[PDB]
Amino acid sequence: MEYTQLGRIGLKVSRLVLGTMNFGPTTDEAESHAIMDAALDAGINFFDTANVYGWGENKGRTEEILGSWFAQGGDRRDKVVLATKVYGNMGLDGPAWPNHDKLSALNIRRSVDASLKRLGTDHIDLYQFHHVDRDTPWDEIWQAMDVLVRQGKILYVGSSNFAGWNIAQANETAARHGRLGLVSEQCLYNLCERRAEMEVVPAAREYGLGVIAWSPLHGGLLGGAIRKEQEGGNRRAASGRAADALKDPQQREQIQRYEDLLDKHGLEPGEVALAWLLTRPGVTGPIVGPRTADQLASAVRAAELTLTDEVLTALDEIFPGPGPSPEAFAW
Amino acid sequence: MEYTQLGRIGLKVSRLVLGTMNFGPTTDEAESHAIMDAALDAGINFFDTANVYGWGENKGRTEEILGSWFAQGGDRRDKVVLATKVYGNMGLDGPAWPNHDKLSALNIRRSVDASLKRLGTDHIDLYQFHHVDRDTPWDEIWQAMDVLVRQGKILYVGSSNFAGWNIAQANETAARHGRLGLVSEQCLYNLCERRAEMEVVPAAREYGLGVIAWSPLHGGLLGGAIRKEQEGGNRRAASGRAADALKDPQQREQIQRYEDLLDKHGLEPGEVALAWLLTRPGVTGPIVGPRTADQLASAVRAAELTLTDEVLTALDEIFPGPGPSPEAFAW
Amino acid sequence: MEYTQLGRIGLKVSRLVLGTMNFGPTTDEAESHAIMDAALDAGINFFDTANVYGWGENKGRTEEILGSWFAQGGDRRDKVVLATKVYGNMGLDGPAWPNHDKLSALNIRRSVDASLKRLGTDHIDLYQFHHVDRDTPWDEIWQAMDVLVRQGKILYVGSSNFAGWNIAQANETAARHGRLGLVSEQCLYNLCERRAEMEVVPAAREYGLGVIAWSPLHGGLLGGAIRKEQEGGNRRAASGRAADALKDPQQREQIQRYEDLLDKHGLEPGEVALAWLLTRPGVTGPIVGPRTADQLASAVRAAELTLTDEVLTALDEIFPGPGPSPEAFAW
Amino acid sequence: MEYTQLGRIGLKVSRLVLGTMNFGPTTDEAESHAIMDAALDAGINFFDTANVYGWGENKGRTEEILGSWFAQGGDRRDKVVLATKVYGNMGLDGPAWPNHDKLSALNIRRSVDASLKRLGTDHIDLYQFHHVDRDTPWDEIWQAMDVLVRQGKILYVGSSNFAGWNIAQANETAARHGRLGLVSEQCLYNLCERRAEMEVVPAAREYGLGVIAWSPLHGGLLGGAIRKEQEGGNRRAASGRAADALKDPQQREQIQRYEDLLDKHGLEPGEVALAWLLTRPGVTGPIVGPRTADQLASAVRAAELTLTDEVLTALDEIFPGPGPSPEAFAW
Amino acid sequence: MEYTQLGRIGLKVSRLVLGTMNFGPTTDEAESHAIMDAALDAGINFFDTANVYGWGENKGRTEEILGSWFAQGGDRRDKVVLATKVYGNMGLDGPAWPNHDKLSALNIRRSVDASLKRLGTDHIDLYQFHHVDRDTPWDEIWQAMDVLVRQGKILYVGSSNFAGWNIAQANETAARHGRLGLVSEQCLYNLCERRAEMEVVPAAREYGLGVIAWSPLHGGLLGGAIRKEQEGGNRRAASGRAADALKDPQQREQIQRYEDLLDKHGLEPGEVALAWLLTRPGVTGPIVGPRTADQLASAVRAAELTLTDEVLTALDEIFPGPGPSPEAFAW
């Protein structure tokens, strides 16, 4: 396993981050536990989850599944850098009761306690804002996070779905009063969606945040979804983001040229998409979303893959990116 | 003439900013002087220029044309908020001698003295960085600008062609030591190019910066370029940014839709493109680029236009924007 | 003559401040100079003026009258604490040209140089904001005033017509970065108008500001205006603030009881109104507004007067005050 | 017993520091307890240990031996300034699992709780970084240590095996936000290795850190290891740093001239090496590493020794040092 | 010519720095002027000098030689980053009159004015402390430098012959109050003397200082001095640092190994020693000290040299370095 520092901080993480969103609604508990043990066996020490994972009536299920995994012993908790999230409504889906979503100090207090209980642990290593909350100012947010740091309930704070200027404002505010700022940003970044290159990744690099890419396969769309389109099973690529893209002709053409490109070179689409993120400057790693143990082993092979300059140049022509602002739209 | 504060600061400006880029390479000194006289007569108090305007061997020409205008007296200098720019290479076009472009304290010192000399004035009201310089840190930049403030050579500092996160870093750094930060950002923003909406204008709004939109007509492309395409004269729409667009079938189709829409509503294309910027949240105003006194009078009418909701919705249809990050590309 | 520190600072001032607003529009130059000579002879070392004094086409005349008085030599400038003001429109009466009124760094730059030219002096001791400007933030204002301090063009900064919370925000902002804040507030305070007791004077006292009361006779209303009502001449009491009040039966009765009370006690109404202000806690002193040299001598006698508890109690009955907020309107 | 302040802080310490590295792997529990009772009887109030001491499969053993010593009662814990360390891998020897070594907030949290449990105490008086960790920034480190300070788990923070500029950076960062910085540096310093004089000790003295010298006899080499080379026993000088130095004829000769010089002066080599350290400016004292009660008594005699200038000169000729940078290598 | 940023700041400099110490005592004025024109022609934009250069009764002569060079016109001053130095005694050689050497605010004021006059310029781009002054505190030094920055007499401040911890203390102190810190350290660093690697270069790199190496050929010792040993000319290698080294058998043996090695590879000793420094991480460049225009051309060739791994390995065996502290002397 390749390791790296999480941005500027002293925390060392595997360059594959184990995502757990499938655990519960797509992968059942026993298989979820098998994936996590396999992940630890391959040297992955960085697990991402969220309080909302499980979905609908089953929100919190994923954190519970991790909690029973930890309760097996064997230094599982001690070996894992455990990350979860606050922002989402944990009540009935639909409009939330006021302050039962977003980032008020009130919702931060109640959300972290509920996550700690479900996870069966006295601390979260990386507590992440699931999304920017424009209505909560940074002196309120850092007040609340600092309470948790001092109480030993969290170690580090991270962001997710921030704009680049939110990262700058957050960490400048933290720095003025001696607080450790955001240590990482979890943003949507993959071959199909590269606009985090404009400002999110540049701001993260300047401020020394790790960068971890969620939906690195665009929800399975980059996993060989065309070749597999008629297959059954409970596959994520049959729904949501991937199925939406495949209905659209120009995006379908993109994935078709992508799967054709990799047929020529004899490479696997899921593995190449992960390996491609590992080449992008500033990227700590993809957050892999295995549904099965074989998909985890596939991600592990993806981390050992070297893409040639030919393949990298060809991917760039199929999936151009904007580069940074202001050059991306001005000069 | 409608006035507004420039973002959060005490300076009041006309919502039309007079751009001077045409003065010299496209508009001669005599017509330039008349345009500026008409600008003052119409209540426009805010002029934008740059050291490099003039182009090629005539870099600095524009500042000199403004200087001979001020030298005529009549309270012209006292009435005008004078903005200019540093970053550009003022030597022979091509690779600059080291530190003769960009934002080192060395180049700021020599550039500001050259501009004051050409402009024939002892102070610049708004001194702007022409572009982000990723290699100069903000404590060096704010040191150099603070020397100029305390010497009385400049009043305010502004940015141009920044990323949103550069605005945040700049003003947070300035605030740690009680310096007035950036007061305005001058960015490309018009019907044709709306990606400043993702992060640049959001960051400017959070930090209380004015937002002044350069090339509000995309270089004359939105001024009725199709209807005018076969005309003679020294037209900006006949070259550069506008000519390249009218070559691409889809960008041309976009502009054809625009010109056809406005013919059904009795509106002029250049006036609508300016009036549209004036409706955008956080926009101080467009930096108009008249080539003729007639075109300046047209802009003054544009500032009095009220666009109906039907025209605004139709324009959104032809010229969609991305809105803010992270929603623009994630959720 | 009684001297006191101006609030918390080391400057020592006479408890009578010489107001000059009459000098020009009401008192001619010759007698203006006479009043100033007699003021200095009585030990008054603190003169208040403004760039706009003179009024209409003659704005700046008062400063020019002071200029020619200092020009006579005699250690006059060295012996006087010279205070003037920035904010007002120095152009034609009516809507001002943008940034030719208010408190932008731009208007501060141009106003102080024109005041120094008219006064014939290289520095102003106390440079006062004529009025709060809600559109200019304090980091911009303190930037501009710091330039003046460091250039030696001013010594101290004071306010006029501020709200109490403006005084707090201004001096907290200055203190943050090691600037000396406002040293004095010049507010309307007299027997007829006591609402400065609510917040302005409490905030001034908390922050250690001098308090100097403008129109201490309410524009002559408290100077015997009813007794003198039928006399001709260009008396201030005939017009403006005093005229309006006397046309109101409720306020006219107040003044009638006032003048009758002091007739019974053998006291002069002008002198009593000044002595009253000198008893108020936090008040440095009144800014007297003599129209004649006799009225100046009267002010000097007011500063030697001791008002009995009986007279003070009776004045309180005729001219009740609100006291401080929140008690003034809540509990 | 001579006492001194630990650098600039209020803590008073014996100029002999009791090192505990031998307790467990070299000296058994009952003899270790005997030495610690004798240390206290001698007035030594300052004990140094580490989580890793005990070595190999027995890491943590030394802390347990001190824990059983404290558990005897008798005001032993109340009388002792207890120092331990964080940084070392406490797992199986080899490369550590990520974040189970070094100075991340994660490893600091897990290491201190493990040490407190082994030591059987609720607080550590001096918690030391065992080595600089170049990948962890000082705002992460000080956040972590400040959590422990505010929870009462530690009192002071110290460093060990730092460069001089690490000390400066650490304490400047601490001071910015009012944290007490490093109070001591534990560095390798003895007659054989004097390069801490170049920058480590000068930086410590500038920032007012104590300087406590580890391996003061260079692992037993300066304790008469030539004369005793044929001796048997679990001797430290028979292995490690000392045995290496004697395999090398070039420094073997240095030890020979040293043992010869002290033969002539009737002095004990172990005692002289400690007494020499007590003469060095800025040195709090040496960390003695007795294997036996008798070597502790010998160290106590060493602290009462007076080395004549004759001997100091001769020692400085056998064992020259570089003095401070930049003079040590430039001018 | 290769260019690089000077550490973290926006200043771009040639990776060859032209040293001027030879100009005067070794190279006469005419050929000094020729070398400087040749340097500019080659694209070298960064000149180093000092007030004392000239030596003895001719101290200041080197600055005058640069002054007459600038006075020729030709954009010479505008194109050059001009560095000079303060600390040295400018009076009669011997013990200095108090405050006529070292870094008191008093000596800094008088030294900079003398240097500006001799240089014939109104500003120094990079004003450097010639040596650490342990007796002057950093708030005194930064006050003096800030006076010069705000007066426009200097732009940047640099250090020379500092210890690593001095760099840290200097820049932390500067940053506390918004001052730009040291931008560069000028230290002795070459194949013969590598102890700047222990702590000076690491501190410089951490704090983002440029590193410019003085006497990069060890005063000519590395320029072929054994092969040239019996030659005439006013050769720097015939005296001083290089001559004393060739006296010592161990040191002479090292240079012999060097020259013999390069004969086997068809490389020149002066050029290799320069090219070697350009490979060292964190080194901005060597400060070349040509005696002739031919030696300047040879340095320019050295900047285009690529040293093979074989040669770099062989040089490291001849000229081992200590690497960073604490590992250099501890672990």
Ligand SMILES: NC(=O)c1ccc[n+]([C@@H]2O[C@H](COP(=O)([O-])OP(=O)(O)OC[C@H]3O[C@@H](n4cnc5c(N)ncnc54)[C@H](OP(=O)(O)O)[C@@H]3O)[C@@H](O)[C@H]2O)c1
């Ligand atoms: N911060 C946020 O807003 C956010 C949002 C979403 C996710 N996340 C995090 O990012 C993690 C991953 O997101 P994701 O599940 O959407 O990632 P993804 O990799 O885009 O999608 C997962 C799907 O890709 C396929 N796949 C996975 N590994 C593969 C492989 N080695 N080869 C071929 N196909 C493979 C599987 O598709 P099939 O099922 O069709 O076989 C799998 O269910 C989540 O677990 C969560 O921790 C964060």
Ligand SMILES: NC(=O)c1ccc[n+]([C@@H]2O[C@H](COP(=O)([O-])OP(=O)(O)OC[C@H]3O[C@@H](n4cnc5c(N)ncnc54)[C@H](OP(=O)(O)O)[C@@H]3O)[C@@H](O)[C@H]2O)c1
């Ligand atoms: N900060 C930067 O990087 C940057 C870059 C560019 C410009 N600027 C600034 O922004 C200012 C404006 O830039 P620009 O000149 O490109 O503006 P623009 O308005 O996009 O282009 C100017 C052209 O639009 C046409 N036009 C202007 N006013 C019109 C009207 N009322 N009705 C119809 N057509 C009209 C004319 O084209 P025809 O000649 O074809 O008639 C005119 O020459 C410049 O003067 C400069 O100050 C800044």
Ligand SMILES: NC(=O)c1ccc[n+]([C@@H]2O[C@H](COP(=O)([O-])OP(=O)(O)OC[C@H]3O[C@@H](n4cnc5c(N)ncnc54)[C@H](OP(=O)(O)O)[C@@H]3O)[C@@H](O)[C@H]2O)c1
């Ligand atoms: N900061 C602001 O916004 C502001 C506003 C107004 C004034 N000020 C300052 O405050 C100063 C005083 O204002 P003001 O002129 O309105 O003062 P005032 O004392 O309220 O009114 C002046 C008039 O009162 C009469 N008077 C003056 N002294 C007298 C005395 N000893 N006995 C009897 N009557 C006397 C005269 O009225 P008759 O002519 O009827 O005899 C005189 O013209 C001004 O000079 C100016 O410096 C500041």
Ligand SMILES: NC(=O)c1ccc[n+]([C@@H]2O[C@H](COP(=O)([O-])OP(=O)(O)OC[C@H]3O[C@@H](n4cnc5c(N)ncnc54)[C@H](OP(=O)(O)O)[C@@H]3O)[C@@H](O)[C@H]2O)c1
């Ligand atoms: N921070 C770090 O990196 C680090 C590293 C090492 C140590 N330390 C600390 O520094 C302490 C001392 O280290 P150390 O054990 O290596 O010290 P040391 O004094 O250099 O070596 C100990 C050995 O010196 C001999 N000795 C001790 N006292 C003597 C005396 N009075 N007369 C003659 N010989 C004597 C004994 O050797 P024989 O057994 O051969 O008789 C003893 O085992 C440790 O206990 C530990 O607390 C810290």
Ligand SMILES: NC(=O)c1ccc[n+]([C@@H]2O[C@H](COP(=O)([O-])OP(=O)(O)OC[C@H]3O[C@@H](n4cnc5c(N)ncnc54)[C@H](OP(=O)(O)O)[C@@H]3O)[C@@H](O)[C@H]2O)c1
């Ligand atoms: N901050 C300080 O304390 C300090 C101290 C000293 C110097 N400096 C600065 O560092 C600069 C350089 O120092 P330095 O003069 O001692 O440099 P140096 O390069 O170590 O010594 C100069 C000598 O090396 C020889 N040489 C130079 N270039 C050569 C080449 N391309 N090929 C072969 N030989 C070459 C010449 O020796 P021969 O004459 O024998 O031919 C020349 O006189 C000085 O000018 C000064 O700016 C600073």
